[PDB]
Amino acid sequence: DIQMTQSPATLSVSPGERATLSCRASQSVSSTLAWYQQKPGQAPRLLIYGASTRATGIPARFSGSGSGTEFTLTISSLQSEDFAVYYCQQYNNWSTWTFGQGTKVDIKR
Amino acid sequence: CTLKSFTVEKGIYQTSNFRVQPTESIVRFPNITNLCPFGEVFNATRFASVYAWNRKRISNCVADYSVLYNSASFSTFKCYGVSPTKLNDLCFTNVYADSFVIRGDEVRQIAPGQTGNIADYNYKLPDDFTGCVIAWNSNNLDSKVGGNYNYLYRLFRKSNLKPFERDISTEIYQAGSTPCNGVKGFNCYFPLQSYGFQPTYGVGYQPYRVVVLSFELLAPATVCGPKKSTNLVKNKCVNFNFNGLTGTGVLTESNKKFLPFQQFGRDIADTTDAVRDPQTLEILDITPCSFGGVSVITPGTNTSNQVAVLYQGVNCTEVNVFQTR
Amino acid sequence: VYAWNRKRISNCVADYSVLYNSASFSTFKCYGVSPTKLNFTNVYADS
Amino acid sequence: AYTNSFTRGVYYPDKVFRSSVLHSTQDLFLPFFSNVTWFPVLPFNDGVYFASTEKSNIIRGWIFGTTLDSKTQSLLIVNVVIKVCEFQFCNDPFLGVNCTFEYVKNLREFVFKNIDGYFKIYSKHTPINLVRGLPQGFSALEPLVDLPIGINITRFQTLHAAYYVGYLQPRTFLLKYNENGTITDAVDCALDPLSETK
Amino acid sequence: VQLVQSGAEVKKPGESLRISCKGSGHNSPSYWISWVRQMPGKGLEWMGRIDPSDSYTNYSPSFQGHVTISADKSISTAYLQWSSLQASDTAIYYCARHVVALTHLYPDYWGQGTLVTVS
Ligand SMILES: *[C@@H]1O[C@H](CO)[C@@H](O[C@@H]2O[C@H](CO)[C@@H](O[C@@H]3O[C@H](CO)[C@@H](O)[C@H](O)[C@@H]3O)[C@H](O)[C@H]2NC(C)=O)[C@H](O)[C@H]1NC(C)=O
Ligand SMILES: *[C@@H]1O[C@H](CO)[C@@H](O[C@@H]2O[C@H](CO)[C@@H](O)[C@H](O)[C@H]2NC(C)=O)[C@H](O)[C@H]1NC(C)=O
Ligand SMILES: *[C@@H]1O[C@H](CO)[C@@H](O)[C@H](O)[C@H]1NC(C)=O
Ligand SMILES: *[C@@H]1O[C@H](CO)[C@@H](O)[C@H](O)[C@H]1NC(C)=O
């Protein structure tokens, strides 16, 4: 399988700042990566797919980048409704879809 | 202008040709209510191996090739025997949609009369192929890190494949003198070989999904392009497009009764003398619109410039008039 | 191998059937031409 | 057991209508004056011509299975019911006294030909008085049904009335359509020098 | 585009169970419906996926011989079935879709999830 590892485990960012999350794969996954948002008590919501394309209906402040084994999710101008757990899942067609452990975004203090 | 001389001597000169010009146009396609399933063939999760290429039959539906032509995703769309732009109108008595996957450098091998391993042992088109070939890179779907060996291809085919022939045989190819009896080894090789599609390979080895649309043009049209059927007009010189058959003539009621199977009838002239309207099974005969030779009868220009005219082999209707034989 | 020899075969008639039929060749791989259809403007043999 | 086929193997090649026109067509036709078996499973071969003398419509229909063990789909016409399902037939199918299509004293002629994966079922029904064999009277078969099934089609069998099996071959056939769009005669351009001259 | 799952289930250990998830508005008959497990305090973990038209499964190695995923394209439904339930199976199971866009894939909808309690 292709293990997915995210970083950091948890962070703390004040509103208006820029949050950064990293995702690493064991072996390349080209660009078949997707970032999700799972607010407490809510089902996961897609944010970025293809490692760079923003899902329709999502605020433009979210952005994805990277390629190969390393990918990054950037949340510019963090908002009060952006506090959730973000995962990175690869969906290579002829392969088992693996999942990362996730990263938690909280209020800086 | 015909004589190319200013002076015209006495006589009759066949100056011009008089053609009754049609004013109205009629378009009547089959009144079919359905959309042909292009997405299922194209938007498919996984494609079959080239050696075992899949075939779908599209029928009893209204096709719209405008979307496929307009789409920019298709890397290479090459139509032989038909214009991709004009596909919107042509009807088809039968449509085949072949699907498979090859590598980029093999895309050329999928062409009428082409040669090579793919064309010779996997998928061969006839010399008179009448269809389109649409190929698009599938490096994001048919390639994995470490090599996607799901897709196969026939390499050592004892018998060269005939056009539109699929060979799924897995018999060990006996390339030597002694037989194999289903036992592999030297001079005994498995006929199929796998593409190890990897995302890091060059475009030449990168996967490509290929769809071949083969059309049969003749019989009732199961599939026709998108069009708006209009009301027909009896007894009028008009253009007409019946089931994709294009013509210009008078559409008249015909006493002659076609056989139930018969759709298009042609006489010794081989022209479509009569047609069967798709909306209603009414046999409409077609007669060429009145055509003749305008012969200018002129006395010598020296004597005068008054000139008479003779429309040949026409009645004094379509044109101090004299009707003669 | 660092000083691999090269012979040129020319002005003769080549028969590759014997080479292919040989069962003592542990490896025999052809690139760009099938060995069956070998029956060329120049031939090189590196050893 | 064989009998003369006479000239009772002519059908309409195309759907075109040709009034009072002699037309030349190079196509699969039953050879004229060719021995035909007189009545198991019969291979489809190039073509098939089946003539039934069932006065009471005894023959319900036919089956078309090359594998003969239900592995492959088979046409099932029974009498009018037509089905193209993957039927599981018995070892000796008969009638007692994944479907892709479904439709619901006397001599009955049918021509079965599979070309480009297209099944064609032509028919001709006429009163007869000669029990022994096919009458030596010219007849035509209009296309009863045409199903572009696309199946392989290499063998067939009947359902139970003697019957015959002929074969079609490429034969340039001069066909004489009459004013009523009816074929009254036909010439096989390879029967003999006289036919070639005609 | 819409997926509807079944209601929450409570079963004793060892009892068989099957949860359903009906899809609609799919691009073509050949899509990818997949199941994902989520324990109360754990993270997301892929289990398997099917293409109902082909009914071809790709069970995860950690879930191969633990659950069976089936589909019925006539009703466009997918089913996740436990032959024998255990306390560890207590979790929320979601069904997601992955449509094909010629060039690449695209996940459109995410199921609301069904809570299963084995006790
Ligand atoms: C296979 O599935 C993909 C994914 O849905 C299809 O791509 C989509 O195709 C539609 C049209 O068929 C595109 O909509 C177009 O939008 C533009 C405006 O951007 C509009 O001007 C057009 O008239 C049309 O409505 C849609 O953008 C496109 N999606 C993507 C992500 O590119 C594809 O058409 C499907 N192919 C088959 C053969 O089913
Ligand atoms: C499909 O039809 C072809 C043509 O009739 C069959 O080819 C025959 O195959 C058998 C064994 O597979 C051979 O013994 C014959 O010699 C083949 N015929 C010819 C003309 O070469 C083929 O078997 C059929 N396939 C199925 C599944 O029925
Ligand atoms: C010409 O038309 C008139 C009436 O339209 C008809 O009486 C006459 O027979 C026609 N003659 C020819 C030669 O068509
Ligand atoms: C054509 O058939 C009809 C009835 O079948 C008959 O009345 C007519 O006379 C036939 N044609 C000729 C030229 O007799």
Side-chain angles (χ1 to χ4, degrees), chain A, chain B residues 1-39 41-45 47-68 70-73 75-76 79-85 87-89 91-155 160-161 163-164 166-173 175-183 185-204 206-226 229-234 237-251 254-255 258 260 262-272 274-275 277-325, chain C residues 1-19 21-27 29-38 41-47, chain D residues 1-7 9-13 15-25 27-53 55-59 61-82 84-104 106-112 114-117 119 122-123 125-143 145-150 152 154 156-178 180-198, chain E residues 1-101 103-119:
Chain A
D1 299 334
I2 310 180
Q3 293 299 307
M4 308 302 301
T5 60
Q6 302 176 234
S7 177
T10 64
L11 58 77
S12 318
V13 165
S14 294
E17 300 177 359
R18 180 175 297 178
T20 307
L21 300 177
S22 59
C23 175
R24 183 180 60 84
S26 56
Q27 284 287 337
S28 177
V29 272
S30 173
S31 60
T32 74
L33 186 66
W35 292 85
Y36 295 85
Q37 187 184 23
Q38 184 180 9
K39 301 185 183 181
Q42 296 183 350
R45 299 178 179 179
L46 182 69
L47 306 182
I48 305 299
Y49 70 93
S52 63
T53 306
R54 298 173 179 174
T56 62
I58 305 302
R61 58 177 175 273
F62 301 86
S63 61
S65 60
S67 60
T69 61
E70 297 181 358
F71 307 83
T72 302
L73 178 70
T74 300
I75 311 179
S76 301
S77 180
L78 187 72
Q79 303 302 334
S80 60
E81 65 282 3
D82 303 0
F83 303 111
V85 182
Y86 302 86
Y87 310 87
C88 54
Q89 180 185 7
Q90 68 84 8
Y91 41 78
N92 173 272
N93 189 8
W94 307 87
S95 306
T96 70
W97 300 354
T98 61
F99 240 114
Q101 83 297 17
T103 298
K104 196 176 187 299
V105 175
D106 294 354
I107 296 169
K108 182 185 178 183
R109 64 142 298 170
Chain B
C1 286
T2 303
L3 289 184
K4 296 287 181 298
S5 173
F6 267 71
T7 309
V8 177
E9 301 177 358
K10 182 170 70 66
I12 182 176
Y13 307 89
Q14 179 174 15
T15 63
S16 175
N17 299 273
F18 146 85
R19 288 287 296 97
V20 175
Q21 305 308 333
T23 59
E24 311 180 8
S25 181
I26 299 165
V27 180
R28 285 210 148 195
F29 290 13
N31 49 15
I32 310 178
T33 57
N34 199 278
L35 182 61
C36 295
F38 289 106
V41 182
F42 280 84
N43 269 319
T45 53
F47 279 53
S49 295
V50 69
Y51 86 96
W53 47 271
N54 168 23
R55 170 168 282 190
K56 184 94 172 186
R57 279 199 297 274
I58 300 178
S59 58
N60 293 336
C61 62
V62 184
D64 176 5
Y65 315 94
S66 57
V67 60
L68 311 179
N70 302 13
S71 178
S73 60
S75 70
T76 302
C79 291
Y80 310 83
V82 67
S83 173
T85 61
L87 257 175
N88 297 15
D89 289 5
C91 282
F92 311 106
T93 62
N94 179 0
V95 173
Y96 288 101
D98 295 335
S99 61
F100 53 84
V101 168
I102 49 179
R103 69 191 188 91
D105 299 329
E106 293 174 353
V107 174
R108 69 206 66 178
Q109 293 198 29
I110 301 300
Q114 243 291 10
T115 53
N117 58 331
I118 301 296
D120 294 358
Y121 302 152
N122 299 258
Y123 187 85
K124 180 176 178 180
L125 286 175
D127 303 2
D128 57 358
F129 173 77
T130 302
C132 298
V133 184
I134 305 175
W136 69 88
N137 178 281
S138 57
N139 190 17
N140 304 335
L141 301 181
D142 309 337
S143 57
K144 69 146 66 181
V145 173
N148 181 19
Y149 300 86
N150 170 264
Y151 294 92
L152 312 178
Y153 68 99
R154 183 173 304 278
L155 177 57
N160 201 97
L161 271 181
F164 289 139
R166 183 172 55 270
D167 177 13
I168 61 180
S169 176
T170 58
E171 299 294 350
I172 302 302
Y173 183 84
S177 301
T178 60
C180 308
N181 299 117
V183 181
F186 185 71
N187 299 336
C188 293
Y189 314 138
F190 196 76
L192 304 179
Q193 188 68 6
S194 184
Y195 303 97
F197 286 116
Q198 188 181 358
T200 60
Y201 293 165
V203 293
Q206 282 181 10
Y208 278 80
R209 285 176 172 194
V210 180
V211 181
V212 179
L213 295 178
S214 305
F215 298 100
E216 300 185 0
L217 175 56
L218 300 170
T222 56
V223 173
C224 286
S229 55
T230 70
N231 178 14
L232 64 79
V233 180
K234 299 186 176 67
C237 270
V238 310
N239 314 18
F240 64 88
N241 176 9
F242 275 82
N243 299 14
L245 290 62
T246 60
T248 300
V250 178
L251 297 162
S254 75
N255 68 332
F258 276 17
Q262 302 181 314
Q263 299 307 335
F264 321 120
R266 52 172 63 96
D267 295 2
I268 176 56
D270 314 334
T271 66
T272 53
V275 300
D277 187 311
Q279 302 176 227
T280 299
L281 299 181
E282 184 180 2
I283 305 303
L284 307 178
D285 194 359
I286 311 185
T287 303
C289 287
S290 305
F291 74 101
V294 182
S295 294
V296 168
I297 299 167
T298 182
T301 55
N302 298 338
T303 303
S304 166
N305 295 338
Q306 186 183 358
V307 185
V309 180
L310 174 70
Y311 298 85
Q312 286 184 4
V314 296
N315 206 341
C316 294
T317 56
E318 290 69 359
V319 182
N320 187 26
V321 178
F322 193 2
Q323 183 68 94
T324 68
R325 293 197 168 184
Chain C
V1 69
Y2 87 100
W4 50 273
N5 175 27
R6 165 166 285 186
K7 183 98 173 186
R8 188 194 176 184
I9 293 176
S10 59
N11 185 18
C12 58
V13 182
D15 178 7
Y16 312 91
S17 60
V18 61
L19 306 180
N21 299 15
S22 174
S24 59
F25 291 140
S26 57
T27 301
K29 291 185 175 182
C30 294
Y31 309 86
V33 52
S34 300
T36 58
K37 210 74 185 301
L38 287 173
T41 62
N42 181 13
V43 170
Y44 286 109
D46 302 330
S47 60
Chain D
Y2 292 92
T3 184
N4 187 323
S5 54
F6 310 109
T7 66
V10 171
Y11 66 90
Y12 289 84
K15 292 186 179 299
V16 163
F17 176 81
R18 296 138 173 180
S19 53
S20 301
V21 163
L22 281 62
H23 192 275
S24 174
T25 294
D27 195 355
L28 299 181
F29 269 87
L30 181 68
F32 275 18
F33 301 97
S34 54
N35 283 26
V36 289
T37 307
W38 180 22
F39 286 77
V41 186
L42 289 303
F44 198 98
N45 306 312
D46 301 0
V48 177
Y49 164 80
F50 184 100
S52 63
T53 61
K55 56 177 179 177
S56 302
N57 198 324
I58 301 297
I59 291 173
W62 309 274
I63 287 170
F64 292 78
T66 182
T67 58
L68 303 170
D69 57 7
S70 182
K71 282 179 178 177
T72 187
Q73 288 188 354
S74 169
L75 177 59
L76 179 58
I77 301 177
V78 178
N79 187 26
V80 181
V81 179
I82 305 172
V84 300
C85 314
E86 187 183 1
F87 291 106
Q88 177 62 66
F89 294 110
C90 306
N91 301 330
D92 181 5
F94 67 90
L95 181 63
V97 178
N98 185 16
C99 307
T100 55
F101 175 87
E102 180 178 0
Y103 170 83
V104 178
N106 300 275
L107 171 58
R108 300 186 294 174
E109 297 181 326
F110 312 92
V111 171
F112 307 151
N114 275 90
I115 313 177
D116 303 1
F119 180 92
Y122 311 83
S123 67
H125 325 278
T126 179
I128 52 166
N129 303 335
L130 179 60
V131 58
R132 180 176 59 269
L134 308 176
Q136 191 167 11
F138 194 89
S139 304
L141 294 81
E142 55 273 14
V145 185
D146 183 7
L147 290 172
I149 54 173
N152 203 7
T154 62
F156 86 97
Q157 188 177 20
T158 181
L159 299 174
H160 301 287
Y163 60 89
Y164 317 86
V165 178
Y167 317 104
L168 307 177
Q169 303 174 356
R171 289 297 189 85
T172 309
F173 258 63
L174 176 64
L175 305 179
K176 169 180 175 59
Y177 303 99
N178 78 333
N180 254 321
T182 293
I183 309 181
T184 61
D185 191 322
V187 180
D188 183 330
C189 305
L191 176 56
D192 37 355
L194 173 52
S195 302
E196 289 183 358
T197 307
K198 286 178 185 175
Chain E
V1 187
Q2 183 61 40
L3 311 179
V4 173
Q5 294 183 227
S6 58
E9 300 292 352
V10 51
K11 292 291 184 178
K12 300 181 179 181
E15 294 177 350
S16 61
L17 176 63
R18 190 176 96 169
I19 59 177
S20 65
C21 166
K22 303 192 177 183
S24 59
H26 27 273
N27 193 341
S28 98
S30 181
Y31 52 95
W32 279 119
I33 187 166
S34 62
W35 292 95
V36 176
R37 184 175 71 181
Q38 172 68 30
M39 280 176 182
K42 210 187 172 184
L44 298 171
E45 43 178 344
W46 188 76
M47 297 174 57
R49 66 179 180 269
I50 307 180
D51 184 317
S53 55
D54 187 15
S55 181
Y56 161 65
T57 65
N58 192 219
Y59 294 90
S60 170
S62 180
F63 303 85
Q64 192 78 23
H66 202 159
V67 285
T68 306
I69 64 184
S70 60
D72 188 334
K73 63 180 183 179
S74 65
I75 50 173
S76 302
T77 308
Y79 304 100
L80 174 60
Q81 185 274 357
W82 291 259
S83 60
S84 178
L85 283 171
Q86 61 182 12
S88 180
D89 300 330
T90 296
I92 305 173
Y93 296 87
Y94 303 83
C95 55
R97 193 207 294 175
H98 276 253
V99 293
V100 174
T103 59
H104 58 68
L105 256 65
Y106 171 81
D108 55 3
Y109 185 85
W110 250 84
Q112 60 274 27
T114 303
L115 177 62
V116 179
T117 304
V118 185
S119 179

Short mmCIF file of all heavy atoms in Angstrom, two decimals, chain B residues 39-40 42-46 73 136-141 209, chain E residues 27-32 51 53 98 100-105, unseen atoms left out:
data_model
loop_
_atom_site.label_atom_id
_atom_site.label_comp_id
_atom_site.label_asym_id
_atom_site.label_seq_id
_atom_site.Cartn_x
_atom_site.Cartn_y
_atom_site.Cartn_z
N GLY B 39 -21.53 8.43 -23.04
CA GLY B 39 -20.76 8.49 -21.80
C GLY B 39 -20.38 7.11 -21.28
O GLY B 39 -19.26 6.91 -20.81
N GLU B 40 -21.31 6.16 -21.36
CA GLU B 40 -21.02 4.82 -20.85
C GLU B 40 -19.80 4.23 -21.52
O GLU B 40 -18.92 3.67 -20.85
CB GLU B 40 -22.24 3.92 -21.05
N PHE B 42 -17.47 6.01 -23.16
CA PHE B 42 -16.33 6.88 -22.88
C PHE B 42 -16.07 6.99 -21.38
O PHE B 42 -15.00 6.61 -20.89
CB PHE B 42 -16.57 8.27 -23.49
CG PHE B 42 -16.29 8.33 -24.95
CD1 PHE B 42 -17.25 7.94 -25.87
CD2 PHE B 42 -15.07 8.77 -25.42
CE1 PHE B 42 -16.99 7.99 -27.23
CE2 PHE B 42 -14.80 8.83 -26.77
CZ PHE B 42 -15.76 8.44 -27.67
N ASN B 43 -17.04 7.52 -20.63
CA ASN B 43 -16.86 7.69 -19.19
C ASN B 43 -16.99 6.35 -18.48
O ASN B 43 -17.93 6.13 -17.70
CB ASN B 43 -17.86 8.70 -18.64
CG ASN B 43 -17.31 10.12 -18.64
OD1 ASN B 43 -16.15 10.35 -18.30
ND2 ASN B 43 -18.15 11.09 -19.01
N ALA B 44 -16.05 5.44 -18.75
CA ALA B 44 -16.02 4.12 -18.13
C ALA B 44 -14.82 4.03 -17.20
O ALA B 44 -13.74 4.53 -17.52
CB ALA B 44 -15.95 3.03 -19.20
N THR B 45 -15.02 3.38 -16.05
CA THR B 45 -13.95 3.29 -15.06
C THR B 45 -12.72 2.59 -15.61
O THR B 45 -11.59 3.05 -15.42
CB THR B 45 -14.45 2.57 -13.81
OG1 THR B 45 -15.01 1.31 -14.17
CG2 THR B 45 -15.50 3.41 -13.09
N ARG B 46 -12.92 1.47 -16.30
CA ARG B 46 -11.81 0.66 -16.78
C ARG B 46 -12.11 0.17 -18.18
O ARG B 46 -13.25 -0.18 -18.50
CB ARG B 46 -11.55 -0.54 -15.85
N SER B 73 -10.94 17.54 -24.67
CA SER B 73 -10.19 16.53 -23.93
C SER B 73 -9.60 15.49 -24.87
O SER B 73 -8.44 15.08 -24.70
CB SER B 73 -11.10 15.86 -22.90
OG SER B 73 -12.21 15.24 -23.52
N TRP B 136 -7.42 9.40 -26.39
CA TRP B 136 -7.04 10.39 -25.40
C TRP B 136 -6.14 9.73 -24.36
O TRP B 136 -6.39 8.61 -23.92
CB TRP B 136 -8.27 11.00 -24.72
CG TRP B 136 -9.02 10.06 -23.84
CD1 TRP B 136 -8.80 9.81 -22.52
CD2 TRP B 136 -10.14 9.25 -24.22
NE1 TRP B 136 -9.70 8.88 -22.05
CE2 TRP B 136 -10.54 8.53 -23.07
CE3 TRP B 136 -10.84 9.06 -25.41
CZ2 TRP B 136 -11.60 7.63 -23.09
CZ3 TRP B 136 -11.90 8.17 -25.42
CH2 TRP B 136 -12.27 7.47 -24.27
N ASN B 137 -5.09 10.45 -23.97
CA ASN B 137 -4.19 9.96 -22.95
C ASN B 137 -4.95 9.65 -21.67
O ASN B 137 -5.81 10.43 -21.24
CB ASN B 137 -3.09 10.98 -22.66
CG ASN B 137 -2.15 10.54 -21.56
OD1 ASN B 137 -2.47 10.65 -20.38
ND2 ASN B 137 -0.98 10.04 -21.95
N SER B 138 -4.64 8.51 -21.06
CA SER B 138 -5.25 8.08 -19.81
C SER B 138 -4.18 7.81 -18.76
O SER B 138 -4.29 6.88 -17.96
CB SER B 138 -6.11 6.84 -20.03
OG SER B 138 -5.35 5.79 -20.59
N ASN B 139 -3.14 8.65 -18.75
CA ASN B 139 -2.05 8.46 -17.81
C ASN B 139 -2.50 8.63 -16.37
O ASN B 139 -1.85 8.09 -15.46
CB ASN B 139 -0.91 9.44 -18.12
CG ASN B 139 0.35 9.13 -17.35
OD1 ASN B 139 0.52 8.03 -16.82
ND2 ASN B 139 1.25 10.10 -17.28
N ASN B 140 -3.58 9.36 -16.14
CA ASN B 140 -4.10 9.57 -14.79
C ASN B 140 -5.07 8.47 -14.36
O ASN B 140 -5.52 8.49 -13.21
CB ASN B 140 -4.81 10.93 -14.72
CG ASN B 140 -3.90 12.08 -15.12
OD1 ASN B 140 -2.68 11.98 -15.03
ND2 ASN B 140 -4.50 13.17 -15.58
N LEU B 141 -5.39 7.53 -15.24
CA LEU B 141 -6.33 6.46 -14.93
C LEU B 141 -5.79 5.07 -15.18
O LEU B 141 -6.20 4.14 -14.48
CB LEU B 141 -7.62 6.64 -15.76
CG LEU B 141 -8.36 7.96 -15.57
CD1 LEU B 141 -9.61 7.98 -16.43
CD2 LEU B 141 -8.71 8.16 -14.10
N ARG B 209 -6.58 5.73 -23.99
CA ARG B 209 -7.87 5.10 -24.23
C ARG B 209 -8.33 5.46 -25.64
O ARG B 209 -8.38 6.64 -26.00
CB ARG B 209 -8.89 5.56 -23.20
CG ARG B 209 -8.70 4.94 -21.83
CD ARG B 209 -9.67 5.50 -20.81
NE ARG B 209 -9.59 4.77 -19.54
CZ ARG B 209 -10.49 4.86 -18.57
NH1 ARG B 209 -11.56 5.62 -18.68
NH2 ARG B 209 -10.30 4.16 -17.45
N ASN E 27 -22.90 9.98 -13.66
CA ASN E 27 -22.52 10.35 -15.02
C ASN E 27 -22.78 9.20 -15.99
O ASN E 27 -23.27 9.41 -17.10
CB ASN E 27 -21.04 10.76 -15.06
CG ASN E 27 -20.65 11.43 -16.35
OD1 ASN E 27 -21.34 11.31 -17.37
ND2 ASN E 27 -19.54 12.16 -16.33
N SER E 28 -22.46 7.98 -15.58
CA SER E 28 -22.60 6.81 -16.43
C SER E 28 -22.82 5.60 -15.53
O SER E 28 -22.68 5.70 -14.31
CB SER E 28 -21.36 6.62 -17.32
OG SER E 28 -20.48 5.65 -16.76
N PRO E 29 -23.17 4.45 -16.11
CA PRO E 29 -23.32 3.24 -15.29
C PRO E 29 -22.02 2.72 -14.71
O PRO E 29 -22.06 1.82 -13.86
CB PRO E 29 -23.93 2.23 -16.26
CG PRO E 29 -23.52 2.70 -17.61
CD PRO E 29 -23.50 4.20 -17.52
N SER E 30 -20.87 3.26 -15.12
CA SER E 30 -19.57 2.80 -14.66
C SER E 30 -18.94 3.90 -13.81
O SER E 30 -18.22 4.76 -14.31
CB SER E 30 -18.68 2.42 -15.84
OG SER E 30 -17.42 1.94 -15.40
N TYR E 31 -19.24 3.87 -12.52
CA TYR E 31 -18.68 4.78 -11.53
C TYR E 31 -18.05 3.95 -10.40
O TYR E 31 -17.96 2.72 -10.51
CB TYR E 31 -19.77 5.74 -11.06
CG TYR E 31 -21.04 5.06 -10.60
CD1 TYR E 31 -21.26 4.78 -9.26
CD2 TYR E 31 -22.03 4.71 -11.51
CE1 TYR E 31 -22.42 4.16 -8.83
CE2 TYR E 31 -23.20 4.10 -11.09
CZ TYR E 31 -23.39 3.83 -9.76
OH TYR E 31 -24.55 3.22 -9.34
N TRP E 32 -17.61 4.62 -9.33
CA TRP E 32 -16.98 3.95 -8.20
C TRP E 32 -17.63 4.34 -6.88
O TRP E 32 -17.41 5.45 -6.38
CB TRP E 32 -15.49 4.28 -8.14
CG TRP E 32 -14.64 3.48 -9.06
CD1 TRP E 32 -13.86 3.95 -10.08
CD2 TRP E 32 -14.47 2.06 -9.05
NE1 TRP E 32 -13.22 2.91 -10.71
CE2 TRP E 32 -13.57 1.74 -10.09
CE3 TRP E 32 -14.98 1.02 -8.27
CZ2 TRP E 32 -13.18 0.43 -10.37
CZ3 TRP E 32 -14.59 -0.28 -8.54
CH2 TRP E 32 -13.71 -0.56 -9.58
N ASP E 51 -17.79 -1.01 -8.86
CA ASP E 51 -18.42 -0.41 -10.03
C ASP E 51 -19.68 -1.23 -10.33
O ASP E 51 -19.58 -2.33 -10.88
CB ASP E 51 -17.48 -0.40 -11.23
CG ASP E 51 -18.07 0.31 -12.44
OD1 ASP E 51 -19.26 0.09 -12.73
OD2 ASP E 51 -17.34 1.09 -13.09
N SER E 53 -21.98 -1.51 -12.47
CA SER E 53 -22.12 -2.09 -13.81
C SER E 53 -21.27 -3.34 -13.95
O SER E 53 -21.73 -4.35 -14.49
CB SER E 53 -21.74 -1.05 -14.87
OG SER E 53 -20.44 -0.53 -14.63
N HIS E 98 -17.19 8.12 -6.80
CA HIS E 98 -16.05 8.61 -7.58
C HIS E 98 -16.41 8.41 -9.06
O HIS E 98 -16.28 7.32 -9.60
CB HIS E 98 -14.77 7.88 -7.22
CG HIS E 98 -14.06 8.45 -6.03
ND1 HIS E 98 -12.90 9.18 -6.13
CD2 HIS E 98 -14.35 8.38 -4.71
CE1 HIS E 98 -12.50 9.54 -4.93
NE2 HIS E 98 -13.36 9.07 -4.05
N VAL E 100 -16.17 9.16 -13.23
CA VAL E 100 -15.10 9.20 -14.21
C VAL E 100 -15.29 10.42 -15.10
O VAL E 100 -16.41 10.69 -15.58
CB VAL E 100 -15.07 7.91 -15.05
CG1 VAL E 100 -14.03 8.02 -16.16
CG2 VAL E 100 -14.78 6.71 -14.16
N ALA E 101 -14.21 11.16 -15.33
CA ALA E 101 -14.24 12.37 -16.15
C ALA E 101 -13.24 12.23 -17.29
O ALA E 101 -12.49 13.15 -17.62
CB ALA E 101 -13.93 13.61 -15.30
N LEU E 102 -13.23 11.05 -17.91
CA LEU E 102 -12.34 10.78 -19.03
C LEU E 102 -10.89 11.00 -18.63
O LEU E 102 -10.14 10.03 -18.45
CB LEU E 102 -12.70 11.68 -20.22
N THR E 103 -10.49 12.26 -18.49
CA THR E 103 -9.11 12.56 -18.14
C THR E 103 -8.74 12.01 -16.77
O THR E 103 -7.62 11.51 -16.59
CB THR E 103 -8.87 14.07 -18.17
OG1 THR E 103 -9.75 14.71 -17.23
CG2 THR E 103 -9.12 14.63 -19.56
N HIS E 104 -9.65 12.09 -15.81
CA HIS E 104 -9.35 11.70 -14.43
C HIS E 104 -10.65 11.37 -13.73
O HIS E 104 -11.73 11.38 -14.33
CB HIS E 104 -8.58 12.82 -13.72
CG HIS E 104 -9.30 14.13 -13.71
ND1 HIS E 104 -10.45 14.33 -12.98
CD2 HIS E 104 -9.04 15.30 -14.34
CE1 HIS E 104 -10.87 15.58 -13.16
NE2 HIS E 104 -10.03 16.18 -13.98
N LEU E 105 -10.56 11.09 -12.43
CA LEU E 105 -11.71 10.79 -11.59
C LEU E 105 -12.18 12.06 -10.88
O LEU E 105 -11.52 13.10 -10.90
CB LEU E 105 -11.36 9.72 -10.55
CG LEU E 105 -11.90 8.31 -10.83
CD1 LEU E 105 -11.27 7.73 -12.08
CD2 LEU E 105 -11.64 7.41 -9.63
#
